[model samples]
Target chain A: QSNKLIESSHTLTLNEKRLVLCAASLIDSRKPLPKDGYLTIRADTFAEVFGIDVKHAYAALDDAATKLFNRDIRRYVKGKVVERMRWVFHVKYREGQGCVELGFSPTIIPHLTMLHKEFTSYQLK
Target chain B: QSNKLIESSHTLTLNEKRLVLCAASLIDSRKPLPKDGYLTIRADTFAEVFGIDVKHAYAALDDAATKLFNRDIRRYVKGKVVERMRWVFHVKYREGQGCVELGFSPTIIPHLTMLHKEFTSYQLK
Candidate 1:
């Protein structure tokens, strides 16, 4: 008997690309993040792209990246390379028992949604 | 016999015009004056115009305007308008013996020259 396991790869969406660009630009430019140390794209840029000035993208990314890189998980068992990914990617992940799992909790999604809603209202004004 | 006095008016030279434009732009734009509260024109613009980026135009003008407007003088004797001129024009003047005397003190000129010299060095770099 022969058995094969397939792994799925996720391609970055346009929105994701924009987020990466903005976050990377801010970090690379050495500009201090906003007063709250949260990264936020300008409303005009958002409006130009997604037709929505969705807020919390930066915050969500920050939290996500922070959570993922803070722990060791089995999926990230590649050792130092996985550890270094924390610095390179803005996503949170953890490794345990040689398995890596993303650190995004469902509860955080609603909070992020609320942030987006509020930002939309502000942009409308 | 009647005595007739011919009053002379100093016209703004091209160099002087650039200085005024830079000073006014800074003050009007409300940008924080350089760390020294001194205004400076970009060297490129200076070189394009006069083939030299003589520095301290802002400092000289600041001092000149400051001295002229800070005190009571007969030339500014018209009251509020003259007082207003102090806020508007960048020059130094004094009033004594019923006549307003321009106050470009000799000592200040050398100090201003030093400042200009330093600025030139910086611009050249």
Candidate 2:
């Protein structure tokens, strides 16, 4: 389905966006959201997946989690505003566990679910 | 030859480091540094090479240039006092041209030149 998710303005750094996508990838958009409404993104896993330093990944995961918690996406229609929505409903960082629990905002869930079978639906190219 | 460039601490974001390396790659490490002592990194080139949005790449290129201008590297030896050096001696951002001109620090020339034939000498993995 053609959607505006990819065209929307998400004010997030590249690393932050990557982290959010990693968490989103674990969810099956066609299926019901996770029972806890959250997904665990491990720092070590992020490091391995991105081939980055472990410590840098931990710091980035924590920083992105904090920023994404307050982050919002704005949709524009022909240069006019349509809707403004938060990117995540909630976020919790487990420093000891080296992971971040992220829950997608309800408003954005539809776009995430309907736009693609998974995160692969949208390609930057 | 074995060197401490990789082992030393370079306080820069991943993107900033990549930008530095891209400029460094154009130079012949086996020979003297560039006569002008400056290398231009085009944002459009960076975008294409890294498969990122051109606009996003421009913004990132500008931001990284500003940060890297004031950035420095620190070396540690057996948990003792050692040397601290700036990463770049000079940086010029041509917003209209969508490029950044960078010059490596004199103190770091040997490391960049002698360490490897070019930027490939040091690999993160």
Local distance difference test, each candidate: 0.29, 0.61
Which numbered prediction scores highest in lDDT against the true structure?
2
Candidate 1 local lDDT, B1-125, one digit each (tens): 00100010123334443443343333322443232223434434445455553454334333433333232211223342111111121121221111111222211222333333333544654
lDDT, candidate 2, A4-109, per-residue tens: 4554424577777676567666767467765534577899999887778886777788777666654535444567433334455445556667777766543455
lDDT of 2 at B121: 47
In the range B1-125, model 2's lDDT, one tens digit per residue, is 32455544244578876776677666785577774256788999998877789977878887777666545344445673233344554555666688876655544544554434434545557
Please give the distance, in angstroms, between residue B25's alpha carbon in candidate 1 and its true position after superposition.
57
Q: How well is each residue in A101-122 modelled by candidate 1, as lDDT tens digits?
A: 1212211222333333333465
Query: DockQ of all candidates, in order?
Result: 0.01, 0.01
Candidate 1 chain B lDDT trough over 10 residues, lowest sum: B1-10
**lDDT, model 2:** 0.61
Docking class for model 2 is: incorrect
